[PDB]
Structure 1
Amino acid sequence: GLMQFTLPVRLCKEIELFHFDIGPFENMWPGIFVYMVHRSCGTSCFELEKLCRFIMSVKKNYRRVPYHNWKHAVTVAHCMYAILQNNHTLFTDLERKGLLIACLCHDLDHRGFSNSYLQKFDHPLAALYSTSTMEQHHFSQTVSILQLEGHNIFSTLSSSEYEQVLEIIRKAIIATDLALYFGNRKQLEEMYQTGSLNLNNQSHRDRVIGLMMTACDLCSVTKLWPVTKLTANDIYAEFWAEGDEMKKLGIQPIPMMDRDKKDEVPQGQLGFYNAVAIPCYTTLTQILPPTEPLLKACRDNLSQWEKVIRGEE
């Protein structure tokens, strides 16, 4: 009970900031996650023996891929930790528990390929889950790991509290399907602009949690430029292997996944920032003002990509 996780001073202080990078030491990441749960939720919410065993099983089921890996899981969790901790009063007890766990599990057993490619390949998962294919898989993995003996970190919840948390986790994970982001943000934009936004309406909270999940998932765009730039190399390493795989099916891939169009990445980034990233963080700061520091870092990174196009780096 009285065994609190502590971080070295620099991490203890910087972990609280939105732009914290979790570092290149793999074996410190589970520690960093528990630290965040204990501070965000409390030292009671999970039994440590069960929580440590769940983290290590989750870790085992992320694959050694360039981007969609264990580091991404912990990184996405840290961004949510920072939102929760800057918006203390807005979230329930179940929400703080479920969301750190959703984020850690939100890409479980990712193979480094898009839903689109799974469909063009005719992968069996595309047959089982016709929309949001990889995301329904991520949740299915999350449930299977909770059901391993001694892994049920939610064991002490009541049947209704347990069903509520699993439902928060499912919705949270499905929302990381970027194909669903566009409509969600639009509705939230509309509801914020007409004053209809009501955090006591559950369908409204669901949408706000969705937008949070997108924001945590895209959060490489909110880091220090050198983090943002080097993460982009890993992101493209996956895109370009997917394009290779597309060309093996006799399909010309989109420029994003064509390593031949490597020259045009900078412009492709400006489009992603304007089309996806900046709208996401703008709407999130409208709804939750203390997340403004994500919008500001994202705008700085847009300007860094513009300095790349102009030949200033």
Structure 2
Amino acid sequence: GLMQFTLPVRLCKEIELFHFDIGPFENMWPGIFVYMVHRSCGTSCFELEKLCRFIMSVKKNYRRVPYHNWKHAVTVAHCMYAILQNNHTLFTDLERKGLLIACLCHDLDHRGFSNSYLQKFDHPLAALYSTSTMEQHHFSQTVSILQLEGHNIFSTLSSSEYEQVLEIIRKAIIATDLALYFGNRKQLEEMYQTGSLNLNNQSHRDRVIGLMMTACDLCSVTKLWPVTKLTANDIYAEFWAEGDEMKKLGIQPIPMMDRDKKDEVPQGQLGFYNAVAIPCYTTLTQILPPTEPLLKACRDNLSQWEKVIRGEE
């Protein structure tokens, strides 16, 4: 196990920054992920034979959709890497192990549809899981892959440490349900502003890990404008697809998902920066000061969307 992964100089440098884009070379993304684990965790955390076999089974069970794809998984894992590297001593060995795997797995077997469209379609998964429908499925898919012959990357953990990591991964994945983020951020807001926030309180850590997961999940709004803008097309390609499918069930969908209402996208993006993205990275910056560069980048991209509306581009 004296085999390190190395990246070219430019990647080796930019991968440490929050705004890093992992590039269009699909075949470099596994090595980028392993590189991040080795540096975040240790070269010993995982048996490389098993990690590599886990990664490629995880890749396979992500679909060919415009946004909720294998690129998203690795992109979300890189944001978590940057958060963990910039907050060295606040996280247990198990939490670093668990959260990078949770980020890679967080959207397993996503089809490009919201929990809402599964409910109105009456998809079988909506009957199996009444809330956080896709997220419970994503955690299901994660456990399934972990139990394949030769895929159990945690094998060398004790029974209770193994229970702790699957529990970290379950809550981390469930927290990527944006419906739950509002209450979670509201509670974290009050806890930090009445001084009751306490990182030795497990139920507090849980909330703070959940906010990190939302932050990593939304990290496209924290990239340089050209990456943010080009990722928005992919996000809206899924939204408009779901809108089309709503119209096939005989329901006018929200404007956000109606491809006849593209003109409304810039204003809809302001709503999302102001209601979701800026509050998210604000509370995270208050709790984890060194994640400020995510808040600053998000503010720069809000400004870029205001300029789009003003016709300046």
TM-score tier, shorter chain, comes to: over 0.9
Displacement of 1:70: 0.1
Alpha-carbon distance between aligned partners in 2 of 1:16 and 1:75, rounded to the nearest angstrom: 13
Displacement of 1:241: 0.4
Alpha-carbon distance between aligned partners in 2 of 1:268 and 1:252, rounded to the nearest angstrom: 17
User: Which deviations, in whole Å up to 9, do the C-alpha atoms of 1:105-164 show, x marking residues without a partner?
Assistant: 000000000000000000000000000000000000000000000000000000000000
Alpha-carbon distance between aligned partners in 2 of 1:130 and 1:261, rounded to the nearest angstrom: 31
Displacement of 1:45: 0.3
Displacement of 1:69: 0.1
Displacement of 1:36: 0.1
Instruction: Provide the TM-score with structure 2 as the length reference.
Output: 1.00
Q: What residue is the counterpart of 1:77 in the other structure?
A: 77
Alpha-carbon distance between aligned partners in 2 of 1:143 and 1:173, rounded to the nearest angstrom: 12
Displacement of 1:252: 0.4
SS of the residue aligned with 1:173? helix
Alpha-carbon distance between aligned partners in 1 of 2:295 and 2:166, rounded to the nearest angstrom: 30
Displacement of 1:18: 0.1
Alpha-carbon distance between aligned partners in 2 of 1:209 and 1:183, rounded to the nearest angstrom: 14
Displacement of 1:59: 0.1
Alpha-carbon distance between aligned partners in 1 of 2:244 and 2:135, rounded to the nearest angstrom: 23
Q: What residue is the counterpart of 1:300 in the other structure?
A: 300
User: Which deviations, in whole Å up to 9, do the C-alpha atoms of 1:26-83 show, x marking residues without a partner?
Assistant: 0000000000000000000000000000000000000000000000000000000000
Q: What residue is the counterpart of 2:130 in the other structure?
A: 130
User: Which deviations, in whole Å up to 9, do the C-alpha atoms of 1:193-237 show, x marking residues without a partner?
Assistant: 000000000000000000000000000000000000000000000
Q: What residue is the counterpart of 2:183 in the other structure?
A: 183
Instruction: Provide the TM-score with structure 1 as the length reference.
Output: 1.00
Alpha-carbon distance between aligned partners in 2 of 1:231 and 1:54, rounded to the nearest angstrom: 27
Q: What residue is the counterpart of 1:163 in the other structure?
A: 163
User: Which deviations, in whole Å up to 9, do the C-alpha atoms of 1:234-265 show, x marking residues without a partner?
Assistant: 00000000000000000000001000110010
In the alignment, structure 2 segments of 5+ residues that lack a partner are none
Q: What residue is the counterpart of 2:210 in the other structure?
A: 210
Q: Tell me whether 1:275 sits opposite 2:275 in the alignment.
A: yes
Displacement of 1:271: 0.3
Alpha-carbon distance between aligned partners in 2 of 1:172 and 1:35, rounded to the nearest angstrom: 22
Displacement of 1:175: 0.1
Alpha-carbon distance between aligned partners in 1 of 2:164 and 2:221, rounded to the nearest angstrom: 31
Displacement of 1:92: 0.2
Q: What residue is the counterpart of 1:312 in the other structure?
A: 312
Alpha-carbon distance between aligned partners in 2 of 1:19 and 1:303, rounded to the nearest angstrom: 17
Alpha-carbon distance between aligned partners in 2 of 1:120 and 1:231, rounded to the nearest angstrom: 27
Alpha-carbon distance between aligned partners in 2 of 1:270 and 1:122, rounded to the nearest angstrom: 32
SS of the residue aligned with 2:131? coil
Q: What residue is the counterpart of 2:28 in the other structure?
A: 28
Q: What residue is the counterpart of 1:219 in the other structure?
A: 219
SS of the residue aligned with 2:154? coil
Alpha-carbon distance between aligned partners in 1 of 2:249 and 2:221, rounded to the nearest angstrom: 32
Alpha-carbon distance between aligned partners in 1 of 2:103 and 2:208, rounded to the nearest angstrom: 15
Displacement of 1:303: 0.1
Displacement of 1:275: 0.1
Alpha-carbon distance between aligned partners in 2 of 1:134 and 1:256, rounded to the nearest angstrom: 20
Alpha-carbon distance between aligned partners in 1 of 2:144 and 2:58, rounded to the nearest angstrom: 10
Alpha-carbon distance between aligned partners in 2 of 1:176 and 1:289, rounded to the nearest angstrom: 22
Alpha-carbon distance between aligned partners in 2 of 1:183 and 1:259, rounded to the nearest angstrom: 30
Q: What residue is the counterpart of 1:147 in the other structure?
A: 147
Alpha-carbon distance between aligned partners in 1 of 2:241 and 2:17, rounded to the nearest angstrom: 33
Q: What residue is the counterpart of 1:121 in the other structure?
A: 121
Displacement of 1:19: 0.1
SS of the residue aligned with 2:73? helix
SS of the residue aligned with 1:239? helix
Task: Kindly tell me the number of residue pairs found equivalent between the two proteins.
Answer: 313
Alpha-carbon distance between aligned partners in 1 of 2:130 and 2:174, rounded to the nearest angstrom: 13
SS of the residue aligned with 1:109? coil
Displacement of 1:295: 0.0
Displacement of 1:186: 0.2
Alpha-carbon distance between aligned partners in 2 of 1:229 and 1:89, rounded to the nearest angstrom: 34
Displacement of 1:90: 0.2
Displacement of 1:89: 0.4
Displacement of 1:93: 0.3
- Percentage of identical aligned residues: 100
Q: What residue is the counterpart of 2:14 in the other structure?
A: 14
SS of the residue aligned with 2:63? coil
In the alignment, structure 1 segments of 5+ residues that lack a partner are none
Alpha-carbon distance between aligned partners in 1 of 2:211 and 2:252, rounded to the nearest angstrom: 32
Alpha-carbon distance between aligned partners in 2 of 1:147 and 1:81, rounded to the nearest angstrom: 25
